[PDB]
Amino acid sequence: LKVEKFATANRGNGLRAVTPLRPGELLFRSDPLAYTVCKGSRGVVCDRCLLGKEKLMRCSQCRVAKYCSAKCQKKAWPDHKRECKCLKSCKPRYPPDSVRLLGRVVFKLMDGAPSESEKLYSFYDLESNINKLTEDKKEGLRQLVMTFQHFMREEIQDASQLPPAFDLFEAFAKVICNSFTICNAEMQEVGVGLYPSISLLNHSCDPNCSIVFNGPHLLLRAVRDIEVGEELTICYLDMLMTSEERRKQLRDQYCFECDCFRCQTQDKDADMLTGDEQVWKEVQESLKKIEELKAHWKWEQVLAMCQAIISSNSERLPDINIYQLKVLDCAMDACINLGLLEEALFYGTRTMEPYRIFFPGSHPVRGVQVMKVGKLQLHQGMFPQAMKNLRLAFDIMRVTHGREHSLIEDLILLLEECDANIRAS
Ligand SMILES: Nc1ncnc2c1ncn2[C@@H]1O[C@H](C[C@@H](N)CC[C@H](N)C(=O)O)[C@@H](O)[C@H]1O
Ligand SMILES: [Zn+2]
Ligand SMILES: [Zn+2]
Ligand SMILES: [Zn+2]
């Protein structure tokens, strides 16, 4: 093990390097203690492997769980067995993701075989911040508790049917500040899970580690050189957020004030907020709907909304503005999913310099973005350009993804195809 739990001065438990670490070094890997497909991806991706398919087969008993294959259906049965009847009874209604997630967790906790996901830190070690919650938040938790009790009612009727140390209210509180959003290879949000060992990592806006998902599986890597004893951190948040926005989310969701170098010095805020507030505020507001559509894989609607914004703001709002940038990114992704590849490259190319600015060093989201643009270029026959970007994507993803991630093999195949096309030209 290259990492260990320790007690920090002022931020609870954390994780630290046992040995010197190099960029790209694998620190930990884990399957989830428990996970579920997220609200917007339900029925779009396989329940088990979280990969999207034109044809998924519904579970016969609930008609809610969907799978890409008989293999996935079977492997998922232990996790699905006790929720099947609960999902069935409430159809077409469907519980919040956290409720479905904790529904799985409670039966997992009764397995006598230790979960690998809990090697460093267990579900019960998870921070709940109970003494820090606002009254409005505690009220929302009590609403969640009631929803769980009703959702689970065919399987569980009383507290005596779960481990004594398990407390439903504190379990929802643990979920708020220890959940991971599982992303597919293209960085679309597809699931949510608990990975208790990985929950040990404290947050920074300039982290020395990063996580990536390959299906439900999580890989933790160093993303720069790290010294013996140094605290290991990850960034909890989207990079395309101002310091005021990050501070709000970290306060509201994680019960802390971020005092990192970036937050203290408003690092990159001026570039993020390029252009006129009266113009970009309208983009920010429009993104609420655009992001929700994207989360539900509604690509035609996303594209329509983004095109309206991109065309109307072209004379006034620069692409480096984070709101304009998010709209370009959504537009690109909508186009890729609809097979509008020339248009996708048009939007993706415009994201390149801002991504270089806002995702410094080695960040998996930038590696994936560069790979997407490289692949589009190769498709469009722009071989020298594609080759530079595919190599750049490799320079990044070798660190952020590593050779244990299946996307690296995919990338190598594109570079070989591009190379062959160059030699043939
Ligand atoms: N940069 C930070 N400054 C202060 N508290 C932090 C920071 N990052 C994480 N935390 C705390 O850690 C919680 C989330 C946990 N996943 C991390 C490990 C946690 N410190 C523990 O003892 O279990 C947050 O909700 C905060 O309570
Ligand atoms: Zn599957
Ligand atoms: Zn079922
Ligand atoms: Zn910060």
Residue numbers in the entry: 4 to 428
Publication passage describing the model:
SET domain histone methyltransferases (HMTases) mediate epigenetic post-translational histone modifications that govern transcriptional activity, in part by modulating chromatin structure and accessibility of transcription factors and RNA polymerase II (pol Il) to promoters. All SMYDs have the N-terminal terminal portion of SET (N-SET), followed by a Myeloid translocation protein 8, Nervy, and DEAF-1 (MYND) domain, N-terminal to an intermediate or linker sequence (I-SET) of variable length and configuration.
We present here, in addition to the independent high resolution co-crystal structure of the full length human SMYD3 with the S-adenosyl methionine (SAM) analog Sinefungin, a detailed mutational and biochemical assessment of SMYD3 function. Baculoviral SMYD3 was co-crystallized with the SAM analog Sinefungin, and the structure was solved to 1.8 Å resolution. SMYD3-Sinefungin crystallized as 2 symmetry-related molecules/unit cell (P21). The domains comprising the “core” of the split-SET (N-SET, C-SET, post-SET) of SMYD3 and the MYND domains overlay with those of corresponding conventional domains. About one third of the SMYD3 substrate binding site is formed by the Intermediate SET spacer (I-SET) region located C-terminal to MYND. The SMYD3 CTD is a superhelical 9 α-helical bundle which constricts the floor of the substrate binding site opposite to the I-SET domain, preventing the trivial insertion of substrates. In fact, the CTD clamps further down on the peptide binding space of SMYD3 than of SMYD1, featuring a greater superhelical pitch, such that it contacts the MYND domain (circled region of Fig. 8). Close inspection of the overlay indicates that the H4 peptide forms part of the support for the SAM binding pocket in the SET8 structure, whereas the SAM binding pocket is fully formed and stabilized in SMYD3, independent of any substrate.
